[PDB]
Each structure stands twice: as C-alpha cells, then as structure tokens.
Amino acid sequence: PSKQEEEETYSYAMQLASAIVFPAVLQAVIELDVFEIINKAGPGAKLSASEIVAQFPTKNPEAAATMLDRVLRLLVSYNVLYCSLVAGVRLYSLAPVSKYYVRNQNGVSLRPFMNFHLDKALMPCWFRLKEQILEGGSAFHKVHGINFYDYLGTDSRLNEAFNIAMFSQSSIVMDKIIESYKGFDHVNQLVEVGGGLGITLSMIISKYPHIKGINLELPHVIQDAPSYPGVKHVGGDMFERIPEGDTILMKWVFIGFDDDQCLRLLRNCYNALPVDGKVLVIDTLLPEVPENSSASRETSNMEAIGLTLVVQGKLRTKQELKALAIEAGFKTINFEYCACNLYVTEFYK
C-alpha cells in the first residue's frame, strides 16, 4: 500500500540487513571520546569532524576526519546527533539521547553499560540463540561452561566490567527514582540484596541520612566496593540468609530467577523482616502486549539478554508477583510506577 510506504519498507528491510554495524559505529565514536569533545567545547557546541579529529591521537588526521564524518552522519540519521551546515561543512551537536553517554559530574555514563554487551566474553553468546531455542540450556553456558554469576566469580576482568556496568546504569536512574518514589520515611535499617558495588543504597542514604544500610552481595562483588558512608558491605548468599532490618530492597534481581528461587528468596526476606517489615522490588513489569515504542524495545532487549545469560529468569506480571508474595508470607502488595520504565513493587508483610 502506497509508494511512499513501500519505499520506506524497502529501506527498513535494508537497514535491518546491516544492523550489526550500528553498535560497532556507536561504540567506536563513543570510545573515540567524541561526545566528551563536543560536550567540553561548551553548552550546545557544534563541532566539525575536522575539529573533533584535532583531539585524536592520529598520525593521519586527514583520513580520520573523512572517516569520522561518515559515521557522524550515521549517528545523525539514527537520532543520536544533530547536524548544522556552515558553508557546506557539517557541524555536530549532542542530541538528547547522547547526553546519557557523556560523563557527568562524577565521571558516570551509560558507556560501561553499552561496552559490557560488546565484550569479547559476551559477543559469541548473543549469536547462539538459535541453538539455545532448539536444544535448551543457556547460550552463556554453552560458550563458557558455567552459568552467569558463577562464571563472574572466576574472571575478575569480566566481574569488574559487569560491576561497573550495573553501577553506571544504577547511578543514572536512581536520581530519577528517588525523586519519584517518596517511600523512605518509614525506613530506618534498609537491607539491599544483590546491590552490586553499593551505589543504590548510598544514594538513598544521601537523600535520607537517617537510614542505615546493609549491602548483601556475593563476596566477589563486594571485594573492593567503595566505603560509602552509612553502608555496610556483607558477603553472603540471599538464598541462604539475609541480614535483619525493617526494609529489604531488590533492583534488577527478581527478574534473574525462576519461581522456585524467587519463593525461597521471599521466605528469607520474610524471616529477616519484623512483623511490619516490607520488601521493595525495583524492576520492569512484563507488558501485556509488545508494541512499537522505545520502552517496549528496551523491555524486549532486556528479555533477550535474560534469555541469553540466565534462561531461568523472567519479567513478571502484577498477578504473577502478588501470588509469589502471598505464598511467601506477605499480606499487602502495591505497584508504584517510579519513572524510567520501572516500577517499585511493595510486598508488605
């Protein structure tokens, strides 16, 4: 239908045939510090490819500038950069989505998050999904012979790379969640299970300094975590024991586990909480239907990552989460959307 629409469909089909190049181009530009260079130049700066290349460690800036101008035009057509023309020369500025890959005040961005999925330890795993669907099991396990968190405890390089990737995504999002979710008035001893390096707790204690915090984590994660104020790092296993407190918190944890792991975990929360304790679960809820939206696209990608790394896991619906709580001991359950495609799921005991 329609010649305009039929041409758009042909081009999208061609776009899909070579969509492997977009991650490769995005990573190369980002890791050439191009977004840092445009950003440092000042608020709303517009820099030519020749200007940007002046700051590269290159012995042939002529070739680099002609090469770079091609991939910067690519990022413009994918809405990552803006373009302005001054005498037939193209001047590029940061578009909204690029600011998530510019280092902020502390030097944090989504860069180590994107670079984790492009790691040499993970790249061959994405492309064994056909074998995984047909033969069951896990792509990550097919490639490495050990499951995901188990493998991390054997490779410090990838453990560290994963940890910075979680750390970076957490810092970027918790500022918007903390501003959305006003539910720490009745928190005094917060316990975060599978909290990574510790930044989620630290940022809650920074806005709510009455809170003391415990970070329950596997020991290979907490090995050299920073010594945040009011944060105690505890090395154990949330399927064995959870330290005692009045509130338990879980971000990007519940989605990694099957129903039987999830119930053993919520019963350990129940036993660690007091008669009025509560559990907080920060996660995306499973959408009832996929759709053509970047939220839906973000969610599906996460689903695909989960399939590849921890097949056991799943994104769950409201009804799936409520029933898991009730069987574990909890009485009340609430769902509060807290921005960034994320909910806070409250299991009141």
Ligand X SMILES: COc1cc2c(cc1O)[C@H](Cc1ccc(O)cc1)NCC2
Please report, as ranges, the residues that interact with ligand X according to CB under 6 A: 18, 116-117, 252, 255-256, 302-303, 305-306, 309-310, 313, 315
Residue 239 binding partner per list ligand X, ligand SAM, its own copies, none, with a CB distance cut-off of 5 to 8 Å that depends on partner kind: ligand SAM
- Closest residue by Cα to residue 29 from 78, 62, 87: 78
Q: Which 202-261 residues touch its own copies, going by CB under 8 A?
A: none
In the list 46, 103, 117, 264, the residue contacting its own copies (rule: CB under 8 A) is: 117
Token duo for residue 27: 């990573």
**Nearest distance from C-beta of residue 212 to ligand X, angstroms:** 26
Token duo for residue 168: 């970076």
Rounded to 5°, angle at Cα 143 from 140 and 149 = 40
Cβ distance 298 to 100 under 8 Å? no
Applying CB under 8 A, does 296 fall inside the site for its own copies? Answer: yes
SS3 261: helix
d(CA 276, CA 282): 20
Cβ distance 334 to 325 under 8 Å? no
**Nearest distance from C-beta of residue 43 to its own copies, angstroms:** 14
Cβ of 88: how many Cβ atoms within 10 Å?
A: 5
Residue 43 binding partner per list ligand X, its own copies, ligand SAM, none, with a CB distance cut-off of 5 to 8 Å that depends on partner kind: none
Residue 251 binding partner per list ligand SAM, its own copies, ligand X, none, with a CB distance cut-off of 5 to 8 Å that depends on partner kind: ligand SAM
In the list 37, 41, 74, 234, the residue contacting its own copies (rule: CB under 8 A) is: 74
In the list 49, 166, 191, 248, the residue contacting ligand SAM (rule: CB under 6 A) is: 166
Window contacting ligand SAM (CB under 6 A); options: 78-86, 193-201, 283-291, 320-328: 193-201
Applying CB under 6 A, does 112 fall inside the site for ligand SAM? Answer: no
Cβ distance 274 to 343 under 8 Å? no
In the list 26, 52, 140, 196, the residue contacting ligand SAM (rule: CB under 6 A) is: 196
Q: How far is CA 5 from CA 8, 24, 77, 143, in A?
A: 5, 29, 18, 42
Applying CB under 6 A, does 194 fall inside the site for ligand SAM? Answer: yes
Residue type at 224 in one-letter notation: D
In the list 37, 41, 45, 83, the residue contacting its own copies (rule: CB under 8 A) is: 83
Burial of 83 (C-beta count, 10 Å sphere; 0-12/13-18/19+): middle
